[PDB]
Amino acid sequence: NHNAQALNTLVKQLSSKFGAISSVLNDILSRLDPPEAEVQIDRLITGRL
Amino acid sequence: GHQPYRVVVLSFELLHAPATVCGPKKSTNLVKNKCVNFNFNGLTGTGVLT
Amino acid sequence: GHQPYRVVVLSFELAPATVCGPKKSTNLVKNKCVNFNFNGLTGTGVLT
Amino acid sequence: RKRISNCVADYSVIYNFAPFFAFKCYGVSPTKLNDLCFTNVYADSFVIRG
Amino acid sequence: NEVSQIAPGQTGNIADYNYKLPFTGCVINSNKLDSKYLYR
């Protein structure tokens, strides 16, 4: 039960924006230029880490 | 200063029954059971279709 | 917005240096806990 | 409050009108609008102050 | 009007078939003396 709960919680974490416009790496690279997408991507990277 | 300015605002939304106002692009065919890229109406990804 | 405009751009390559700004040159100091600014390398330490 | 639908959405026709000093966006970066199949567009125009 | 042409990124014709900004340099006026030039 504990292992299943931990894995499910880890999997479900890939749905929070953490302060970004979107939680998907697609549909944010297309909607933003290279010198702006880095700021949004960094927050997702830090949260997932 | 204190001189008329013309201002035009455009308002949109991304995911609300997408069937209208689209940019200029062509279309390709469909493939099955093959590792392919996607440009499905805006959404981008990779994988196979069933 | 329609009037043309001339622009002048610049760049750097921050690696030997050749376009160093106007600074002064001093004398080398032997082993002692001293500061150093070696062609932009700023720090403190003992040199031997 | 004009409603826009079923467009080519070629944003290259614009930028040739009267010279503009503000072209600022929120949530979408310019030079990308040729992509991004949208749903509908609302356009408004007015004169506010100098 | 700079925007597209200056700074990395952007594709504004003058930023699509001309000088591309890769960048760490400092960017610094023909309003006069040019009141009356290829475009690529």
mmCIF file of C-alpha atoms in Angstrom:
data_model
loop_
_atom_site.group_PDB
_atom_site.id
_atom_site.type_symbol
_atom_site.label_atom_id
_atom_site.label_comp_id
_atom_site.label_asym_id
_atom_site.label_seq_id
_atom_site.Cartn_x
_atom_site.Cartn_y
_atom_site.Cartn_z
ATOM 1 C CA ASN A 1 0.000 0.000 0.000
ATOM 2 C CA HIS A 2 2.777 2.455 0.897
ATOM 3 C CA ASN A 3 4.749 1.730 -2.279
ATOM 4 C CA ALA A 4 1.642 2.147 -4.442
ATOM 5 C CA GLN A 5 0.716 5.405 -2.701
ATOM 6 C CA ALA A 6 4.238 6.794 -3.118
ATOM 7 C CA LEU A 7 4.390 5.887 -6.812
ATOM 8 C CA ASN A 8 0.906 7.289 -7.472
ATOM 9 C CA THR A 9 1.756 10.551 -5.701
ATOM 10 C CA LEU A 10 4.992 10.831 -7.687
ATOM 11 C CA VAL A 11 3.145 10.224 -10.965
ATOM 12 C CA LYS A 12 0.357 12.702 -10.173
ATOM 13 C CA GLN A 13 2.919 15.470 -9.558
ATOM 14 C CA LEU A 14 3.291 15.953 -13.328
ATOM 15 C CA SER A 15 0.146 18.069 -13.487
ATOM 16 C CA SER A 16 1.055 21.184 -11.453
ATOM 17 C CA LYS A 17 2.194 24.353 -13.197
ATOM 18 C CA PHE A 18 4.362 25.398 -10.200
ATOM 19 C CA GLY A 19 3.993 29.009 -11.361
ATOM 20 C CA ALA A 20 4.041 28.492 -15.128
ATOM 21 C CA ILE A 21 1.410 29.006 -17.809
ATOM 22 C CA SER A 22 1.134 25.272 -18.534
ATOM 23 C CA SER A 23 2.406 21.965 -17.162
ATOM 24 C CA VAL A 24 3.178 20.459 -20.600
ATOM 25 C CA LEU A 25 6.514 21.132 -22.291
ATOM 26 C CA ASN A 26 4.552 21.114 -25.528
ATOM 27 C CA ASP A 27 2.120 24.029 -26.027
ATOM 28 C CA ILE A 28 4.527 26.302 -24.136
ATOM 29 C CA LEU A 29 7.513 26.139 -26.509
ATOM 30 C CA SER A 30 5.146 26.905 -29.397
ATOM 31 C CA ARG A 31 3.375 29.788 -27.632
ATOM 32 C CA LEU A 32 6.596 31.510 -26.494
ATOM 33 C CA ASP A 33 9.880 32.602 -28.032
ATOM 34 C CA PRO A 34 13.223 31.074 -26.940
ATOM 35 C CA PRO A 35 14.298 34.018 -24.714
ATOM 36 C CA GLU A 36 11.119 33.792 -22.627
ATOM 37 C CA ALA A 37 10.401 30.055 -22.405
ATOM 38 C CA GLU A 38 13.482 29.514 -20.213
ATOM 39 C CA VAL A 39 11.952 31.389 -17.269
ATOM 40 C CA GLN A 40 8.808 29.250 -17.361
ATOM 41 C CA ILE A 41 10.728 25.994 -17.892
ATOM 42 C CA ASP A 42 13.058 26.623 -14.935
ATOM 43 C CA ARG A 43 10.192 26.592 -12.417
ATOM 44 C CA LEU A 44 8.929 23.237 -13.707
ATOM 45 C CA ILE A 45 12.457 21.817 -13.572
ATOM 46 C CA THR A 46 12.936 22.946 -9.968
ATOM 47 C CA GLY A 47 9.557 21.617 -8.842
ATOM 48 C CA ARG A 48 10.039 18.200 -10.422
ATOM 49 C CA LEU A 49 13.560 17.967 -8.980
ATOM 50 C CA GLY B 1 1.023 64.671 -25.247
ATOM 51 C CA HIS B 2 -2.731 65.118 -24.816
ATOM 52 C CA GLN B 3 -3.202 64.039 -28.445
ATOM 53 C CA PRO B 4 -5.534 61.266 -29.659
ATOM 54 C CA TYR B 5 -4.131 57.727 -29.746
ATOM 55 C CA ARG B 6 -5.735 54.793 -31.562
ATOM 56 C CA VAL B 7 -5.632 51.541 -29.570
ATOM 57 C CA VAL B 8 -6.756 48.130 -30.848
ATOM 58 C CA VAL B 9 -7.040 45.122 -28.531
ATOM 59 C CA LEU B 10 -7.316 41.474 -29.584
ATOM 60 C CA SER B 11 -8.576 38.845 -27.136
ATOM 61 C CA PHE B 12 -8.318 35.082 -27.590
ATOM 62 C CA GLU B 13 -8.612 31.724 -25.819
ATOM 63 C CA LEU B 14 -6.786 28.463 -26.419
ATOM 64 C CA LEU B 15 -8.908 25.387 -25.616
ATOM 65 C CA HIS B 16 -12.612 26.011 -26.278
ATOM 66 C CA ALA B 17 -14.017 23.671 -28.964
ATOM 67 C CA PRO B 18 -11.236 24.371 -31.496
ATOM 68 C CA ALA B 19 -12.820 24.520 -34.947
ATOM 69 C CA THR B 20 -12.317 28.091 -36.243
ATOM 70 C CA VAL B 21 -9.715 30.832 -36.918
ATOM 71 C CA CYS B 22 -6.535 28.983 -37.899
ATOM 72 C CA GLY B 23 -3.171 29.980 -39.301
ATOM 73 C CA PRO B 24 -1.829 29.292 -42.781
ATOM 74 C CA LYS B 25 -0.555 25.732 -43.157
ATOM 75 C CA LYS B 26 -1.072 22.697 -45.369
ATOM 76 C CA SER B 27 -2.158 19.143 -44.511
ATOM 77 C CA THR B 28 -0.609 15.681 -44.759
ATOM 78 C CA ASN B 29 -1.862 12.098 -44.774
ATOM 79 C CA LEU B 30 -2.465 9.746 -41.835
ATOM 80 C CA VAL B 31 -0.258 6.836 -40.759
ATOM 81 C CA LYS B 32 -0.850 3.935 -38.385
ATOM 82 C CA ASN B 33 1.403 1.800 -36.172
ATOM 83 C CA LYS B 34 4.457 3.975 -36.839
ATOM 84 C CA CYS B 35 6.524 6.294 -34.643
ATOM 85 C CA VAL B 36 5.359 9.679 -35.947
ATOM 86 C CA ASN B 37 5.336 13.327 -34.905
ATOM 87 C CA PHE B 38 2.165 15.351 -34.400
ATOM 88 C CA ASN B 39 0.839 18.790 -35.251
ATOM 89 C CA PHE B 40 -2.776 18.037 -34.333
ATOM 90 C CA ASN B 41 -4.585 21.397 -34.524
ATOM 91 C CA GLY B 42 -1.921 22.913 -32.266
ATOM 92 C CA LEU B 43 -1.004 20.044 -29.956
ATOM 93 C CA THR B 44 2.471 18.611 -30.547
ATOM 94 C CA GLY B 45 3.725 15.176 -29.592
ATOM 95 C CA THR B 46 5.197 11.893 -30.749
ATOM 96 C CA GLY B 47 3.943 8.330 -30.811
ATOM 97 C CA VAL B 48 1.842 5.790 -32.682
ATOM 98 C CA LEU B 49 -1.855 5.688 -33.548
ATOM 99 C CA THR B 50 -4.440 2.953 -33.075
ATOM 100 C CA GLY C 1 7.605 53.092 -37.195
ATOM 101 C CA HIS C 2 8.126 53.740 -40.900
ATOM 102 C CA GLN C 3 11.056 56.159 -40.670
ATOM 103 C CA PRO C 4 14.299 54.194 -41.175
ATOM 104 C CA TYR C 5 16.880 54.173 -38.392
ATOM 105 C CA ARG C 6 20.605 53.455 -38.448
ATOM 106 C CA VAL C 7 22.088 51.367 -35.639
ATOM 107 C CA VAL C 8 25.606 50.505 -34.467
ATOM 108 C CA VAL C 9 26.161 47.208 -32.661
ATOM 109 C CA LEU C 10 29.007 45.857 -30.537
ATOM 110 C CA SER C 11 30.162 42.495 -29.222
ATOM 111 C CA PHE C 12 32.710 40.873 -26.922
ATOM 112 C CA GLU C 13 34.522 37.538 -26.626
ATOM 113 C CA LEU C 14 34.667 37.017 -22.860
ATOM 114 C CA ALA C 15 41.371 33.662 -23.796
ATOM 115 C CA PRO C 16 44.170 36.214 -24.205
ATOM 116 C CA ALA C 17 43.117 39.846 -23.881
ATOM 117 C CA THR C 18 44.085 42.549 -26.374
ATOM 118 C CA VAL C 19 41.551 45.392 -25.956
ATOM 119 C CA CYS C 20 42.090 45.992 -22.239
ATOM 120 C CA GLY C 21 40.963 49.343 -20.871
ATOM 121 C CA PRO C 22 43.251 52.045 -19.479
ATOM 122 C CA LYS C 23 44.692 50.770 -16.179
ATOM 123 C CA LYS C 24 48.019 50.992 -14.359
ATOM 124 C CA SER C 25 50.865 48.484 -14.098
ATOM 125 C CA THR C 26 52.548 47.635 -10.791
ATOM 126 C CA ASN C 27 55.446 45.511 -9.537
ATOM 127 C CA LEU C 28 55.312 41.812 -8.714
ATOM 128 C CA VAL C 29 55.155 40.823 -5.040
ATOM 129 C CA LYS C 30 56.719 37.680 -3.578
ATOM 130 C CA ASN C 31 55.148 35.157 -1.186
ATOM 131 C CA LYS C 32 52.560 36.906 1.014
ATOM 132 C CA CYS C 33 48.800 36.855 1.518
ATOM 133 C CA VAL C 34 47.986 39.595 -1.000
ATOM 134 C CA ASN C 35 45.307 40.546 -3.498
ATOM 135 C CA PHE C 36 45.778 40.159 -7.242
ATOM 136 C CA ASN C 37 44.107 41.467 -10.409
ATOM 137 C CA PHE C 38 45.822 39.407 -13.117
ATOM 138 C CA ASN C 39 44.379 40.704 -16.400
ATOM 139 C CA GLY C 40 40.864 40.579 -14.967
ATOM 140 C CA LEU C 41 41.435 37.618 -12.627
ATOM 141 C CA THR C 42 40.452 39.188 -9.299
ATOM 142 C CA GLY C 43 41.193 37.380 -6.062
ATOM 143 C CA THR C 44 43.363 36.965 -2.986
ATOM 144 C CA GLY C 45 46.097 34.482 -2.185
ATOM 145 C CA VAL C 46 49.808 33.762 -1.896
ATOM 146 C CA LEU C 47 51.916 33.614 -5.063
ATOM 147 C CA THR C 48 54.990 31.396 -5.358
ATOM 148 C CA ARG D 1 -16.631 44.226 -30.357
ATOM 149 C CA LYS D 2 -16.037 42.414 -33.627
ATOM 150 C CA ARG D 3 -16.180 38.612 -33.697
ATOM 151 C CA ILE D 4 -13.662 36.825 -35.933
ATOM 152 C CA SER D 5 -14.013 33.263 -37.220
ATOM 153 C CA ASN D 6 -12.926 31.107 -40.170
ATOM 154 C CA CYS D 7 -9.747 33.005 -41.038
ATOM 155 C CA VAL D 8 -6.476 32.427 -42.810
ATOM 156 C CA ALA D 9 -4.905 34.438 -39.941
ATOM 157 C CA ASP D 10 -1.989 35.776 -41.994
ATOM 158 C CA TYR D 11 -0.471 38.285 -39.575
ATOM 159 C CA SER D 12 1.932 39.427 -42.309
ATOM 160 C CA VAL D 13 -0.759 41.662 -43.829
ATOM 161 C CA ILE D 14 -0.590 43.747 -40.632
ATOM 162 C CA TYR D 15 2.533 45.822 -39.721
ATOM 163 C CA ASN D 16 1.958 47.891 -42.900
ATOM 164 C CA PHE D 17 -0.677 50.193 -41.361
ATOM 165 C CA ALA D 18 0.028 53.519 -39.661
ATOM 166 C CA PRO D 19 3.257 53.402 -37.607
ATOM 167 C CA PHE D 20 2.680 52.002 -34.126
ATOM 168 C CA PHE D 21 4.493 52.575 -30.840
ATOM 169 C CA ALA D 22 2.934 49.865 -28.631
ATOM 170 C CA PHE D 23 2.736 46.220 -29.742
ATOM 171 C CA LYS D 24 2.642 44.482 -26.376
ATOM 172 C CA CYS D 25 1.152 41.048 -25.716
ATOM 173 C CA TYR D 26 0.185 38.961 -22.685
ATOM 174 C CA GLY D 27 0.573 35.183 -22.647
ATOM 175 C CA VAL D 28 1.517 34.776 -26.328
ATOM 176 C CA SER D 29 4.653 36.014 -27.986
ATOM 177 C CA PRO D 30 4.452 37.725 -31.400
ATOM 178 C CA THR D 31 5.870 36.279 -34.655
ATOM 179 C CA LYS D 32 4.241 32.990 -33.580
ATOM 180 C CA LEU D 33 0.578 33.754 -34.371
ATOM 181 C CA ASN D 34 0.880 32.111 -37.800
ATOM 182 C CA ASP D 35 0.850 28.858 -35.808
ATOM 183 C CA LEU D 36 -1.499 28.266 -32.833
ATOM 184 C CA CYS D 37 -4.872 27.270 -34.220
ATOM 185 C CA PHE D 38 -7.245 29.270 -31.998
ATOM 186 C CA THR D 39 -11.001 29.161 -31.305
ATOM 187 C CA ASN D 40 -12.300 32.714 -31.811
ATOM 188 C CA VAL D 41 -10.944 36.265 -31.833
ATOM 189 C CA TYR D 42 -12.454 39.408 -30.305
ATOM 190 C CA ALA D 43 -11.292 42.746 -31.723
ATOM 191 C CA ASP D 44 -11.944 46.181 -30.215
ATOM 192 C CA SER D 45 -10.724 49.677 -31.088
ATOM 193 C CA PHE D 46 -10.934 53.000 -29.258
ATOM 194 C CA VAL D 47 -9.239 56.314 -28.465
ATOM 195 C CA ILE D 48 -8.451 56.932 -24.783
ATOM 196 C CA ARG D 49 -5.952 59.713 -24.035
ATOM 197 C CA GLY D 50 -2.726 61.372 -25.117
ATOM 198 C CA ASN E 1 12.044 49.160 -35.367
ATOM 199 C CA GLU E 2 14.604 46.851 -33.723
ATOM 200 C CA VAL E 3 12.216 44.487 -31.859
ATOM 201 C CA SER E 4 12.564 41.445 -34.128
ATOM 202 C CA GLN E 5 15.927 42.258 -35.729
ATOM 203 C CA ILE E 6 17.715 43.023 -32.444
ATOM 204 C CA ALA E 7 18.046 40.466 -29.599
ATOM 205 C CA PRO E 8 18.240 36.680 -30.097
ATOM 206 C CA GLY E 9 15.245 35.004 -31.682
ATOM 207 C CA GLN E 10 12.310 36.378 -33.669
ATOM 208 C CA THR E 11 11.629 36.015 -37.419
ATOM 209 C CA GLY E 12 10.558 39.362 -38.862
ATOM 210 C CA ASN E 13 11.813 39.137 -42.464
ATOM 211 C CA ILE E 14 14.512 41.642 -41.519
ATOM 212 C CA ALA E 15 15.154 39.056 -38.779
ATOM 213 C CA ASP E 16 14.680 36.066 -41.111
ATOM 214 C CA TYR E 17 16.854 36.861 -44.150
ATOM 215 C CA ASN E 18 19.355 39.280 -42.580
ATOM 216 C CA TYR E 19 21.602 39.694 -39.528
ATOM 217 C CA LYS E 20 20.781 37.159 -36.805
ATOM 218 C CA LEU E 21 21.504 37.911 -33.160
ATOM 219 C CA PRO E 22 23.052 34.744 -31.594
ATOM 220 C CA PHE E 23 24.621 37.086 -27.264
ATOM 221 C CA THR E 24 26.483 39.416 -24.903
ATOM 222 C CA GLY E 25 27.233 42.573 -26.905
ATOM 223 C CA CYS E 26 25.787 46.013 -26.255
ATOM 224 C CA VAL E 27 23.356 47.375 -28.859
ATOM 225 C CA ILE E 28 23.405 51.142 -29.364
ATOM 226 C CA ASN E 29 19.485 57.220 -36.278
ATOM 227 C CA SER E 30 18.554 58.180 -39.840
ATOM 228 C CA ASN E 31 15.630 60.417 -38.834
ATOM 229 C CA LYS E 32 17.774 63.280 -40.132
ATOM 230 C CA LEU E 33 20.134 63.262 -43.148
ATOM 231 C CA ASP E 34 18.082 60.379 -44.639
ATOM 232 C CA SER E 35 14.656 61.999 -44.965
ATOM 233 C CA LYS E 36 14.578 60.964 -48.640
ATOM 234 C CA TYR E 37 18.803 50.935 -49.019
ATOM 235 C CA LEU E 38 18.098 47.314 -49.943
ATOM 236 C CA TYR E 39 15.650 45.156 -47.993
ATOM 237 C CA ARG E 40 16.434 41.503 -48.904
#
